[PDB]
Amino acid sequence: MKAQSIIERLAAGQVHVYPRSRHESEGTRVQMIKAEGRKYLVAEGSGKLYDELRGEEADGVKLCELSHENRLVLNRHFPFTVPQAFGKQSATIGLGDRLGIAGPGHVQTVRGRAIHPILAQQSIRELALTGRDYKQVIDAAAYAVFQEGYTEGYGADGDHLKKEEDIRMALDLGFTMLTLDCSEQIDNEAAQAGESEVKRKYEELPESVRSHYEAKYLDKTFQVGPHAIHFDAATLMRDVLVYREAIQFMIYIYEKYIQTAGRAVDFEISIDETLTPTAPGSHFLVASELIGKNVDIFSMAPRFIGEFQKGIDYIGDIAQFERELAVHAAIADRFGYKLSIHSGADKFSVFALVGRYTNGRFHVKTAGTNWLEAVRIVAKTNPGLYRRMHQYALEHFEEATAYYHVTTNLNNIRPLADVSDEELPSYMNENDARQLLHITYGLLLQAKKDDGSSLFRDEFFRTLSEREEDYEAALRSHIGKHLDLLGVK
Ligand SMILES: [Zn+2]
């Protein structure tokens, strides 16, 4: 019980204290501590806070594991640690951490910037691949703001939810933002089909439904910004076919879980994952239905022309994309929600355009690139460890391609036998090696020997714990490039 002798090593200034982490609650003072390579909670005083925190005692001092339990307790006393919504009228960034250790660095990039962090952000996919739960995602976010004294507030976004089970769960754990992914009710068939065929599939709809869209939309012209959107029969029928059922999904969920939720929630609707790129006029029609039914949209995340792959920059004609971007953006302003950029990390070619055309009102989601900067550190710090996992990613690539859409050319990665140790980090500058390391993250983390220990993960977390100020330095730099290119003041 007395290995809490650690506290005396702290008395002498022989443990790292986290400067901004002191915060009181009535009689108790709580500050955060790394000691022997473990972060700790350290409190002295008296009151409902001290008594509720779990820990070993010694003095009027307690040493608490950074636990889910103790953060629920910190949630009860310290409200900045609790997630919070921000609204559609502001600049936000999603800061995905698939590891639970990118928080503090994420916090240190936003302090001083005119942007709101969505510190906790994972998709259901990432919880599966990594084997984590949503309690953990909030834990790291809430301990990151505490550890760094970021009290200006942060968000928890359940990302890419599709099953109703997931929405209830994310609701239950206090996620303040919800991302309904509907890329899968998109009739990708009707989008490629021919004029005489859409009409066939469209005339197979109820009169009431067909009378609806035609009265509301047909042959009329909508002045968005300096942007006229017009619907002939050929276009209306296609978009109704292509998007109808997905529109119906959004409205059902808004009514069932979002608006009955009892607290503020950001409702992001997402279709960036479709195969059908979201045509601007199509975008107009989906919001116009959502809004005319009094859905309260935080943000739309469409499928832009060209392709947004994981870990790499835009693929397409950037001139065309700007022309699509201007109208999307104009659509989101007339309606008053924001455009949400998925797969946004490393899309350096789109950032100024996004910033300008949205006058700073946008959502940009990063996640894997943070796992990639941690991979950079191993390459910089544990060459052998990186070699061991660079090779395992190789032999399990085609596996992981069942879960992300990437056109990686395996034939652009210099063989491991060919790059010196100090040349390892430069892989994390390269398109193909980046994508290789990007999507294989679930296999690496879950890798076990037939002994059942972690093949990689535990050794990986120790070096990351050891070169922490490095990791955080990388995030500050890589994520800053992003925010400066976006024009965050
Ligand atoms: Zn996404």
Side-chain angles (χ1 to χ4, degrees), residues 1-3 5-275 277-489:
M1 303 191 106
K2 346 300 163 179
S5 87
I6 299 195
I7 285 75
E8 301 286 327
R9 274 157 286 221
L10 154 70
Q14 320 225 325
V15 317
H16 184 41
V17 302
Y18 289 101
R20 317 226 193 181
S21 53
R22 101 289 166 207
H23 305 102
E24 334 171 37
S25 210
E26 213 278 318
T28 323
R29 292 166 143 231
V30 185
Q31 81 201 352
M32 215 193 260
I33 272 298
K34 205 194 179 209
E36 268 100 314
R38 191 181 268 245
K39 289 194 194 194
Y40 274 112
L41 271 164
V42 156
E44 327 76 29
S46 308
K48 286 119 185 286
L49 181 51
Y50 191 107
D51 310 344
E52 279 185 292
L53 283 176
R54 188 162 276 251
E56 300 331 285
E57 267 98 327
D59 315 52
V61 180
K62 188 186 286 157
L63 177 94
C64 309
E65 280 307 326
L66 262 50
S67 49
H68 175 68
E69 301 46 34
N70 279 322
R71 93 130 175 103
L72 296 186
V73 175
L74 285 157
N75 273 173
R76 281 171 55 83
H77 287 256
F78 295 91
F80 70 97
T81 66
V82 173
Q84 142 198 12
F86 305 90
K88 330 147 187 216
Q89 297 299 337
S90 55
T92 70
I93 175 173
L95 292 164
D97 178 26
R98 319 167 143 179
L99 317 175
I101 66 145
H106 282 164
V107 161
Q108 305 162 1
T109 305
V110 279
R111 79 155 79 89
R113 289 252 182 49
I115 186 136
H116 287 287
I118 307 294
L119 271 200
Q121 179 211 300
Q122 290 289 282
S123 70
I124 288 303
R125 197 166 22 176
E126 293 169 308
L127 301 166
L129 297 171
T130 69
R132 287 162 75 232
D133 77 9
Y134 266 142
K135 291 186 167 211
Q136 278 145 359
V137 188
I138 315 191
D139 290 321
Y143 277 127
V145 286
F146 190 92
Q147 144 176 4
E148 312 275 314
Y150 187 89
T151 51
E152 326 184 32
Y154 74 99
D157 158 45
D159 190 42
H160 277 321
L161 310 88
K162 305 158 215 59
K163 293 299 137 224
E164 285 183 53
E165 300 59 61
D166 313 317
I167 290 150
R168 186 59 170 185
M169 161 162 87
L171 271 203
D172 286 319
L173 301 160
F175 279 83
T176 70
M177 176 184 152
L178 294 148
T179 287
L180 187 79
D181 174 88
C182 315
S183 38
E184 290 252 305
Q185 294 92 330
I186 295 269
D187 197 331
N188 283 293
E189 333 297 315
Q192 324 142 10
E195 180 243 311
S196 324
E197 150 150 25
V198 166
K199 169 206 207 141
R200 260 149 41 207
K201 293 191 66 167
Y202 172 79
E203 299 190 308
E204 218 188 320
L205 267 38
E207 288 179 336
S208 47
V209 159
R210 279 183 286 114
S211 285
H212 175 272
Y213 291 92
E214 296 171 18
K216 180 158 175 172
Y217 295 108
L218 192 40
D219 274 328
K220 284 127 205 94
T221 280
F222 307 76
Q223 259 64 59
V224 194
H227 291 293
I229 292 204
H230 180 95
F231 290 87
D232 62 17
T235 295
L236 189 46
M237 292 193 287
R238 198 174 303 270
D239 285 330
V240 183
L241 285 189
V242 175
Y243 297 101
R244 240 189 67 69
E245 293 284 33
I247 298 184
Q248 270 213 296
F249 197 48
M250 298 147 198
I251 295 172
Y252 159 69
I253 277 77
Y254 181 83
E255 302 185 335
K256 186 144 170 189
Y257 303 105
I258 301 306
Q259 149 205 272
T260 61
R263 58 171 175 86
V265 176
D266 297 331
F267 189 52
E268 163 166 306
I269 281 161
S270 147
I271 52 141
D272 59 302
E273 247 166 29
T274 67
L275 293 80
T278 320
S282 304
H283 177 182
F284 181 86
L285 192 144
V286 181
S288 170
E289 295 294 294
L290 290 170
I291 295 294
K293 280 286 267 231
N294 298 115
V295 171
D296 171 22
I297 296 155
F298 167 77
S299 62
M300 217 80 91
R303 217 265 189 202
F304 305 100
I305 49 139
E307 250 178 310
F308 283 68
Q309 311 217 9
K310 277 301 203 128
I312 60 168
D313 197 5
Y314 174 76
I315 304 193
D317 180 325
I318 200 79
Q320 207 93 253
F321 168 93
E322 160 166 32
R323 257 174 265 129
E324 306 246 337
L325 172 62
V327 191
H328 286 304
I331 291 172
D333 277 334
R334 179 256 161 289
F335 285 124
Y337 56 72
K338 306 187 296 189
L339 300 161
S340 202
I341 286 74
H342 288 228
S343 280
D346 322 295
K347 303 299 171 293
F348 295 129
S349 266
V350 306
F351 281 155
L353 288 158
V354 169
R356 287 177 250 157
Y357 277 114
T358 72
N359 202 48
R361 201 178 65 99
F362 54 64
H363 188 61
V364 193
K365 289 202 181 166
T366 88
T369 197
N370 302 292
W371 146 264
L372 285 195
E373 290 312 302
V375 173
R376 211 187 295 269
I377 298 321
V378 170
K380 280 183 192 298
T381 279
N382 208 319
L385 179 69
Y386 174 76
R387 287 190 192 272
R388 267 150 54 222
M389 25 177 99
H390 181 116
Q391 192 72 49
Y392 180 98
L394 267 184
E395 309 159 1
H396 301 288
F397 188 66
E398 94 177 14
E399 270 216 38
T401 68
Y403 294 152
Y404 296 82
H405 162 76
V406 303
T407 82
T408 322
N409 175 19
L410 267 200
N411 205 227
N412 295 335
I413 313 193
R414 308 155 301 173
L416 269 185
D418 281 349
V419 299
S420 71
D421 261 35
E422 268 187 37
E423 279 181 325
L424 290 189
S426 34
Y427 276 116
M428 291 308 100
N429 297 313
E430 331 198 307
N431 287 345
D432 298 87
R434 276 183 67 104
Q435 306 210 281
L436 163 80
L437 275 304
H438 201 300
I439 82 188
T440 46
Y441 69 102
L443 295 161
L444 296 155
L445 295 161
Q446 308 259 0
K448 293 154 291 253
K449 297 129 135 158
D450 44 66
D451 154 22
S453 35
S454 99
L455 179 61
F456 298 131
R457 139 179 271 250
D458 317 321
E459 167 174 16
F460 175 77
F461 266 92
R462 171 194 156 98
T463 166
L464 265 291
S465 176
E466 188 169 318
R467 293 292 214 135
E468 168 183 330
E469 279 179 78
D470 285 21
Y471 187 38
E472 288 158 356
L475 304 165
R476 293 193 253 111
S477 179
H478 194 74
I479 306 277
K481 219 156 106 187
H482 286 65
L483 307 176
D484 303 346
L485 278 166
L486 288 155
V488 180
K489 258 167 268 305

Short mmCIF file of all heavy atoms in Angstrom, two decimals, residues 359-407:
data_model
loop_
_atom_site.label_atom_id
_atom_site.label_comp_id
_atom_site.label_asym_id
_atom_site.label_seq_id
_atom_site.Cartn_x
_atom_site.Cartn_y
_atom_site.Cartn_z
N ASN A 359 -15.19 30.80 -45.19
CA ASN A 359 -14.88 31.94 -44.35
C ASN A 359 -14.58 31.47 -42.94
O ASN A 359 -14.96 32.12 -41.96
CB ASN A 359 -16.02 32.93 -44.38
CG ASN A 359 -15.59 34.30 -43.99
OD1 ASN A 359 -14.59 34.79 -44.50
ND2 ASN A 359 -16.32 34.92 -43.07
N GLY A 360 -13.92 30.33 -42.83
CA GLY A 360 -13.47 29.83 -41.55
C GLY A 360 -14.46 28.98 -40.80
O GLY A 360 -14.14 28.52 -39.70
N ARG A 361 -15.64 28.76 -41.35
CA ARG A 361 -16.68 28.00 -40.67
C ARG A 361 -16.66 26.60 -41.28
O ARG A 361 -17.23 26.38 -42.34
CB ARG A 361 -18.02 28.68 -40.86
CG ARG A 361 -19.03 28.30 -39.84
CD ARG A 361 -20.30 29.09 -40.10
NE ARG A 361 -20.92 28.74 -41.38
CZ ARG A 361 -21.95 27.91 -41.50
NH1 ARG A 361 -22.48 27.35 -40.43
NH2 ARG A 361 -22.45 27.64 -42.70
N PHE A 362 -16.00 25.65 -40.61
CA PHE A 362 -15.82 24.33 -41.21
C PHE A 362 -15.54 23.30 -40.14
O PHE A 362 -15.23 23.63 -38.99
CB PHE A 362 -14.69 24.33 -42.24
CG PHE A 362 -13.38 24.84 -41.70
CD1 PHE A 362 -12.72 24.16 -40.69
CD2 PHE A 362 -12.82 26.00 -42.21
CE1 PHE A 362 -11.53 24.63 -40.18
CE2 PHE A 362 -11.63 26.47 -41.71
CZ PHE A 362 -10.98 25.78 -40.68
N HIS A 363 -15.62 22.04 -40.56
CA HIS A 363 -15.19 20.91 -39.74
C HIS A 363 -14.23 20.05 -40.54
O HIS A 363 -14.52 19.69 -41.68
CB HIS A 363 -16.36 20.04 -39.28
CG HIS A 363 -15.95 19.00 -38.29
ND1 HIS A 363 -15.39 19.31 -37.07
CD2 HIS A 363 -15.99 17.65 -38.35
CE1 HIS A 363 -15.11 18.20 -36.42
NE2 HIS A 363 -15.46 17.18 -37.17
N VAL A 364 -13.10 19.72 -39.93
CA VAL A 364 -12.06 18.92 -40.55
C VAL A 364 -11.69 17.80 -39.59
O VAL A 364 -11.30 18.07 -38.45
CB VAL A 364 -10.83 19.78 -40.90
CG1 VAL A 364 -9.90 19.02 -41.81
CG2 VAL A 364 -11.25 21.03 -41.58
N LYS A 365 -11.79 16.55 -40.05
CA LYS A 365 -11.59 15.36 -39.22
C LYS A 365 -10.23 14.74 -39.50
O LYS A 365 -9.99 14.24 -40.59
CB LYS A 365 -12.68 14.33 -39.50
CG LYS A 365 -14.03 14.69 -38.98
CD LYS A 365 -14.90 13.47 -38.79
CE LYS A 365 -16.28 13.87 -38.29
NZ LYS A 365 -17.30 12.78 -38.39
N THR A 366 -9.36 14.72 -38.51
CA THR A 366 -8.13 13.94 -38.57
C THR A 366 -8.22 12.79 -37.57
O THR A 366 -8.95 12.87 -36.58
CB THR A 366 -6.87 14.79 -38.28
OG1 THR A 366 -6.61 14.80 -36.88
CG2 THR A 366 -7.03 16.22 -38.75
N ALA A 367 -7.48 11.72 -37.85
CA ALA A 367 -7.44 10.58 -36.93
C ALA A 367 -6.24 9.68 -37.19
O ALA A 367 -5.35 9.57 -36.34
CB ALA A 367 -8.74 9.76 -37.03
N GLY A 368 -6.17 9.05 -38.36
CA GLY A 368 -5.08 8.13 -38.62
C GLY A 368 -3.72 8.81 -38.69
O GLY A 368 -2.71 8.23 -38.29
N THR A 369 -3.68 10.04 -39.22
CA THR A 369 -2.41 10.75 -39.35
C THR A 369 -1.73 10.93 -38.00
O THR A 369 -0.50 11.05 -37.94
CB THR A 369 -2.64 12.10 -40.01
OG1 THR A 369 -1.40 12.62 -40.50
CG2 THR A 369 -3.23 13.07 -39.02
N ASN A 370 -2.51 10.95 -36.91
CA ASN A 370 -1.93 11.00 -35.57
C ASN A 370 -1.29 9.68 -35.21
O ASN A 370 -0.22 9.64 -34.59
CB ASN A 370 -3.02 11.35 -34.56
CG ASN A 370 -3.71 12.66 -34.86
OD1 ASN A 370 -3.11 13.72 -34.77
ND2 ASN A 370 -4.98 12.58 -35.20
N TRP A 371 -1.93 8.57 -35.57
CA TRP A 371 -1.28 7.27 -35.47
C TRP A 371 -0.04 7.22 -36.34
O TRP A 371 0.94 6.57 -35.99
CB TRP A 371 -2.28 6.17 -35.84
CG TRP A 371 -1.67 4.99 -36.54
CD1 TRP A 371 -1.60 4.76 -37.88
CD2 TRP A 371 -1.05 3.85 -35.91
NE1 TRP A 371 -0.98 3.56 -38.13
CE2 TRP A 371 -0.63 2.98 -36.94
CE3 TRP A 371 -0.82 3.48 -34.58
CZ2 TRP A 371 0.01 1.77 -36.68
CZ3 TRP A 371 -0.18 2.29 -34.32
CH2 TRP A 371 0.23 1.45 -35.36
N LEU A 372 -0.04 7.93 -37.47
CA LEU A 372 1.13 7.92 -38.33
C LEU A 372 2.28 8.73 -37.74
O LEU A 372 3.45 8.38 -37.97
CB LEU A 372 0.76 8.45 -39.71
CG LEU A 372 -0.02 7.46 -40.56
CD1 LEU A 372 -0.03 7.89 -42.02
CD2 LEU A 372 0.59 6.06 -40.38
N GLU A 373 2.00 9.82 -37.02
CA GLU A 373 3.08 10.57 -36.40
C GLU A 373 3.69 9.80 -35.25
O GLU A 373 4.88 9.94 -34.97
CB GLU A 373 2.60 11.94 -35.91
CG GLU A 373 2.25 12.95 -37.03
CD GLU A 373 3.33 13.04 -38.09
OE1 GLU A 373 4.47 13.36 -37.73
OE2 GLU A 373 3.03 12.78 -39.27
N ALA A 374 2.88 8.99 -34.56
CA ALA A 374 3.45 8.08 -33.58
C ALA A 374 4.33 7.04 -34.24
O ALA A 374 5.36 6.64 -33.68
CB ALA A 374 2.34 7.40 -32.78
N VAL A 375 3.95 6.59 -35.44
CA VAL A 375 4.80 5.67 -36.19
C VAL A 375 6.11 6.34 -36.57
O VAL A 375 7.18 5.71 -36.54
CB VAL A 375 4.05 5.16 -37.42
CG1 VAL A 375 4.98 4.34 -38.29
CG2 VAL A 375 2.85 4.36 -36.99
N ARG A 376 6.06 7.63 -36.91
CA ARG A 376 7.29 8.38 -37.17
C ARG A 376 8.23 8.33 -35.98
O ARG A 376 9.45 8.17 -36.15
CB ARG A 376 6.95 9.83 -37.52
CG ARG A 376 7.93 10.45 -38.47
CD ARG A 376 7.64 11.93 -38.65
NE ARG A 376 6.35 12.24 -39.30
CZ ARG A 376 6.19 12.39 -40.62
NH1 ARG A 376 7.22 12.25 -41.44
NH2 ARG A 376 4.99 12.69 -41.11
N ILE A 377 7.69 8.43 -34.77
CA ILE A 377 8.55 8.46 -33.59
C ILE A 377 9.26 7.12 -33.42
O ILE A 377 10.46 7.08 -33.14
CB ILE A 377 7.74 8.83 -32.33
CG1 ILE A 377 7.16 10.23 -32.47
CG2 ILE A 377 8.63 8.76 -31.10
CD1 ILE A 377 8.06 11.22 -33.14
N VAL A 378 8.54 6.01 -33.58
CA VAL A 378 9.23 4.72 -33.48
C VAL A 378 10.34 4.65 -34.51
O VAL A 378 11.47 4.27 -34.19
CB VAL A 378 8.25 3.54 -33.64
CG1 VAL A 378 9.03 2.25 -33.78
CG2 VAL A 378 7.38 3.44 -32.42
N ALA A 379 10.06 5.05 -35.75
CA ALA A 379 11.11 5.08 -36.77
C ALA A 379 12.28 5.94 -36.31
O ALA A 379 13.44 5.54 -36.47
CB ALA A 379 10.55 5.60 -38.09
N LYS A 380 12.00 7.11 -35.72
CA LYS A 380 13.06 7.96 -35.19
C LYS A 380 13.72 7.35 -33.96
O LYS A 380 14.90 7.59 -33.70
CB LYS A 380 12.53 9.34 -34.81
CG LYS A 380 12.35 10.34 -35.95
CD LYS A 380 11.87 11.68 -35.39
CE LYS A 380 11.40 12.64 -36.48
NZ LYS A 380 12.49 12.99 -37.44
N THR A 381 12.99 6.57 -33.19
CA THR A 381 13.45 6.27 -31.83
C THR A 381 13.76 4.80 -31.60
O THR A 381 14.70 4.47 -30.88
CB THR A 381 12.40 6.73 -30.82
OG1 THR A 381 12.55 8.14 -30.61
CG2 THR A 381 12.52 5.97 -29.50
N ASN A 382 12.97 3.92 -32.20
CA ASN A 382 13.11 2.48 -32.06
C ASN A 382 13.15 1.91 -33.44
O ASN A 382 12.18 1.27 -33.90
CB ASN A 382 11.97 1.92 -31.23
CG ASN A 382 12.36 0.69 -30.51
OD1 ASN A 382 13.06 -0.14 -31.07
ND2 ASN A 382 11.94 0.56 -29.26
N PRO A 383 14.22 2.14 -34.20
CA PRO A 383 14.31 1.61 -35.56
C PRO A 383 13.92 0.15 -35.65
O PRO A 383 13.12 -0.23 -36.51
CB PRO A 383 15.77 1.85 -35.93
CG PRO A 383 16.48 2.13 -34.67
CD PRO A 383 15.48 2.79 -33.79
N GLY A 384 14.46 -0.68 -34.75
CA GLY A 384 14.17 -2.11 -34.81
C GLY A 384 12.69 -2.38 -34.65
O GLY A 384 12.10 -3.17 -35.39
N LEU A 385 12.07 -1.72 -33.67
CA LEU A 385 10.64 -1.89 -33.47
C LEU A 385 9.89 -1.55 -34.75
O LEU A 385 9.10 -2.37 -35.24
CB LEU A 385 10.18 -1.01 -32.31
CG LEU A 385 8.70 -1.10 -32.05
CD1 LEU A 385 8.42 -2.49 -31.49
CD2 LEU A 385 8.29 -0.01 -31.06
N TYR A 386 10.19 -0.39 -35.35
CA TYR A 386 9.59 0.01 -36.62
C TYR A 386 9.83 -1.01 -37.73
O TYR A 386 8.93 -1.31 -38.52
CB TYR A 386 10.11 1.36 -37.09
CG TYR A 386 9.57 1.68 -38.47
CD1 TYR A 386 8.27 2.10 -38.64
CD2 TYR A 386 10.35 1.53 -39.61
CE1 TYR A 386 7.75 2.38 -39.89
CE2 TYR A 386 9.84 1.80 -40.86
CZ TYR A 386 8.54 2.23 -41.01
OH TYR A 386 8.01 2.50 -42.26
N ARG A 387 11.06 -1.51 -37.86
CA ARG A 387 11.30 -2.55 -38.86
C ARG A 387 10.40 -3.75 -38.61
O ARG A 387 9.78 -4.27 -39.54
CB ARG A 387 12.77 -2.98 -38.85
CG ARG A 387 13.73 -1.97 -39.47
CD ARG A 387 15.12 -2.54 -39.66
NE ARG A 387 16.07 -1.47 -39.99
CZ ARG A 387 16.33 -1.05 -41.22
NH1 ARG A 387 15.72 -1.62 -42.26
NH2 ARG A 387 17.19 -0.06 -41.43
N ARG A 388 10.30 -4.18 -37.36
CA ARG A 388 9.47 -5.34 -37.08
C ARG A 388 8.02 -5.11 -37.49
O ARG A 388 7.38 -6.02 -38.04
CB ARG A 388 9.56 -5.70 -35.60
CG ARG A 388 10.64 -6.72 -35.34
CD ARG A 388 11.23 -6.53 -33.97
NE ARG A 388 10.20 -6.53 -32.94
CZ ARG A 388 10.20 -5.69 -31.92
NH1 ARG A 388 11.19 -4.80 -31.81
NH2 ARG A 388 9.22 -5.73 -31.02
N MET A 389 7.50 -3.90 -37.29
CA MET A 389 6.11 -3.65 -37.70
C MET A 389 5.97 -3.18 -39.14
O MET A 389 4.96 -3.48 -39.79
CB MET A 389 5.41 -2.66 -36.77
CG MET A 389 6.26 -1.70 -36.01
SD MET A 389 5.24 -0.56 -35.03
CE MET A 389 5.32 -1.33 -33.43
N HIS A 390 6.95 -2.47 -39.69
CA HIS A 390 6.87 -2.18 -41.12
C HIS A 390 6.73 -3.47 -41.93
O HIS A 390 6.00 -3.50 -42.93
CB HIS A 390 8.10 -1.39 -41.56
CG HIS A 390 8.10 -1.04 -43.02
ND1 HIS A 390 8.06 0.26 -43.46
CD2 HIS A 390 8.18 -1.82 -44.12
CE1 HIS A 390 8.10 0.27 -44.78
NE2 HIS A 390 8.17 -0.98 -45.21
N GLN A 391 7.41 -4.54 -41.51
CA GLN A 391 7.38 -5.79 -42.26
C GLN A 391 6.07 -6.54 -42.08
O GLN A 391 5.58 -7.20 -43.00
CB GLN A 391 8.52 -6.70 -41.82
CG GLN A 391 8.73 -7.86 -42.73
CD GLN A 391 9.32 -7.43 -44.06
OE1 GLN A 391 10.30 -6.70 -44.08
NE2 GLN A 391 8.73 -7.87 -45.16
N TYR A 392 5.51 -6.46 -40.87
CA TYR A 392 4.26 -7.15 -40.59
C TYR A 392 3.10 -6.48 -41.31
O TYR A 392 2.21 -7.17 -41.83
CB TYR A 392 4.06 -7.19 -39.07
CG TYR A 392 2.81 -7.88 -38.60
CD1 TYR A 392 2.83 -9.20 -38.16
CD2 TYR A 392 1.60 -7.19 -38.55
CE1 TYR A 392 1.66 -9.82 -37.70
CE2 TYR A 392 0.44 -7.79 -38.11
CZ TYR A 392 0.47 -9.10 -37.68
OH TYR A 392 -0.71 -9.66 -37.24
N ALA A 393 3.09 -5.14 -41.37
CA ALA A 393 2.17 -4.42 -42.25
C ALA A 393 2.25 -4.94 -43.68
O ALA A 393 1.22 -5.16 -44.32
CB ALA A 393 2.49 -2.92 -42.22
N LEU A 394 3.45 -5.14 -44.19
CA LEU A 394 3.61 -5.69 -45.53
C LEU A 394 2.81 -6.98 -45.72
O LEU A 394 1.98 -7.07 -46.63
CB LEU A 394 5.10 -5.93 -45.81
CG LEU A 394 5.85 -4.80 -46.50
CD1 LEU A 394 7.28 -5.22 -46.79
CD2 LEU A 394 5.14 -4.33 -47.78
N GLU A 395 3.05 -7.99 -44.88
CA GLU A 395 2.50 -9.32 -45.15
C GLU A 395 1.03 -9.44 -44.82
O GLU A 395 0.47 -10.54 -44.92
CB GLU A 395 3.24 -10.39 -44.35
CG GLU A 395 4.75 -10.36 -44.47
CD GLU A 395 5.42 -11.07 -43.31
OE1 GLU A 395 4.70 -11.60 -42.44
OE2 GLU A 395 6.66 -11.10 -43.28
N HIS A 396 0.40 -8.34 -44.41
CA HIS A 396 -1.00 -8.32 -44.02
C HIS A 396 -1.72 -7.13 -44.63
O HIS A 396 -2.75 -6.70 -44.10
CB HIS A 396 -1.16 -8.28 -42.50
CG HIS A 396 -0.52 -9.44 -41.81
ND1 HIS A 396 -1.03 -10.72 -41.87
CD2 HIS A 396 0.60 -9.51 -41.05
CE1 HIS A 396 -0.26 -11.53 -41.16
NE2 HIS A 396 0.74 -10.83 -40.66
N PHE A 397 -1.19 -6.57 -45.72
CA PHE A 397 -1.80 -5.42 -46.35
C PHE A 397 -3.14 -5.79 -46.97
O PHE A 397 -4.19 -5.28 -46.57
CB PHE A 397 -0.86 -4.82 -47.40
CG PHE A 397 -1.34 -3.52 -47.97
CD1 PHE A 397 -1.43 -2.39 -47.17
CD2 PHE A 397 -1.70 -3.43 -49.30
CE1 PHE A 397 -1.87 -1.17 -47.69
CE2 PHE A 397 -2.16 -2.22 -49.84
CZ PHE A 397 -2.23 -1.08 -49.03
N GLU A 398 -3.14 -6.74 -47.92
CA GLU A 398 -4.36 -7.05 -48.66
C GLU A 398 -5.50 -7.41 -47.71
O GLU A 398 -6.66 -7.12 -48.00
CB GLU A 398 -4.10 -8.15 -49.70
CG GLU A 398 -4.38 -9.61 -49.32
CD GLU A 398 -4.15 -10.61 -50.49
OE1 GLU A 398 -3.52 -10.23 -51.51
OE2 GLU A 398 -4.59 -11.78 -50.38
N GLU A 399 -5.17 -7.99 -46.57
CA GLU A 399 -6.11 -8.08 -45.46
C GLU A 399 -6.79 -6.74 -45.25
O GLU A 399 -7.96 -6.55 -45.60
CB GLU A 399 -5.38 -8.48 -44.19
CG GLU A 399 -5.30 -9.95 -43.95
CD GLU A 399 -5.42 -10.27 -42.48
OE1 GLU A 399 -6.22 -9.59 -41.80
OE2 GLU A 399 -4.71 -11.19 -42.01
N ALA A 400 -6.03 -5.79 -44.72
CA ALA A 400 -6.56 -4.54 -44.22
C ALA A 400 -7.27 -3.72 -45.28
O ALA A 400 -7.97 -2.76 -44.93
CB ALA A 400 -5.42 -3.72 -43.60
N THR A 401 -7.11 -4.05 -46.56
CA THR A 401 -7.76 -3.31 -47.63
C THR A 401 -9.24 -3.64 -47.76
O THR A 401 -9.94 -3.01 -48.56
CB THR A 401 -7.06 -3.59 -48.96
OG1 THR A 401 -7.30 -4.96 -49.33
CG2 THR A 401 -5.54 -3.32 -48.83
N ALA A 402 -9.73 -4.60 -46.99
CA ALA A 402 -11.15 -4.88 -46.93
C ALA A 402 -11.91 -3.80 -46.18
O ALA A 402 -13.15 -3.80 -46.24
CB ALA A 402 -11.37 -6.23 -46.26
N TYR A 403 -11.21 -2.89 -45.50
CA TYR A 403 -11.82 -1.94 -44.58
C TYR A 403 -11.62 -0.48 -44.95
O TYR A 403 -12.33 0.37 -44.40
CB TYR A 403 -11.28 -2.16 -43.16
CG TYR A 403 -11.69 -3.48 -42.58
CD1 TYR A 403 -10.91 -4.13 -41.63
CD2 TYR A 403 -12.87 -4.10 -42.98
CE1 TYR A 403 -11.30 -5.34 -41.09
CE2 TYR A 403 -13.27 -5.32 -42.46
CZ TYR A 403 -12.47 -5.94 -41.51
OH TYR A 403 -12.87 -7.14 -40.99
N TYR A 404 -10.68 -0.16 -45.81
CA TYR A 404 -10.49 1.21 -46.26
C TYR A 404 -10.27 1.19 -47.76
O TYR A 404 -9.69 0.24 -48.29
CB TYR A 404 -9.29 1.86 -45.55
CG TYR A 404 -9.46 2.00 -44.06
CD1 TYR A 404 -9.20 0.94 -43.20
CD2 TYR A 404 -9.86 3.21 -43.50
CE1 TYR A 404 -9.35 1.08 -41.84
CE2 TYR A 404 -10.00 3.36 -42.15
CZ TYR A 404 -9.75 2.30 -41.32
OH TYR A 404 -9.92 2.47 -39.97
N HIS A 405 -10.73 2.23 -48.44
CA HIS A 405 -10.53 2.34 -49.89
C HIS A 405 -9.21 3.05 -50.17
O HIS A 405 -9.12 4.27 -50.02
CB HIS A 405 -11.70 3.08 -50.53
CG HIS A 405 -11.37 3.60 -51.89
ND1 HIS A 405 -11.31 2.79 -53.00
CD2 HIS A 405 -11.01 4.83 -52.30
CE1 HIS A 405 -10.96 3.51 -54.05
NE2 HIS A 405 -10.77 4.76 -53.65
N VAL A 406 -8.19 2.30 -50.60
CA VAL A 406 -6.87 2.85 -50.93
C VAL A 406 -6.34 2.20 -52.20
O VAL A 406 -6.55 1.00 -52.42
CB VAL A 406 -5.85 2.68 -49.78
CG1 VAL A 406 -6.35 3.32 -48.49
CG2 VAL A 406 -5.51 1.19 -49.57
N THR A 407 -5.64 2.98 -53.02
CA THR A 407 -5.06 2.50 -54.28
C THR A 407 -3.54 2.44 -54.19
O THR A 407 -2.81 2.69 -55.16
CB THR A 407 -5.49 3.36 -55.46
OG1 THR A 407 -4.67 4.53 -55.52
CG2 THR A 407 -6.92 3.79 -55.28
#
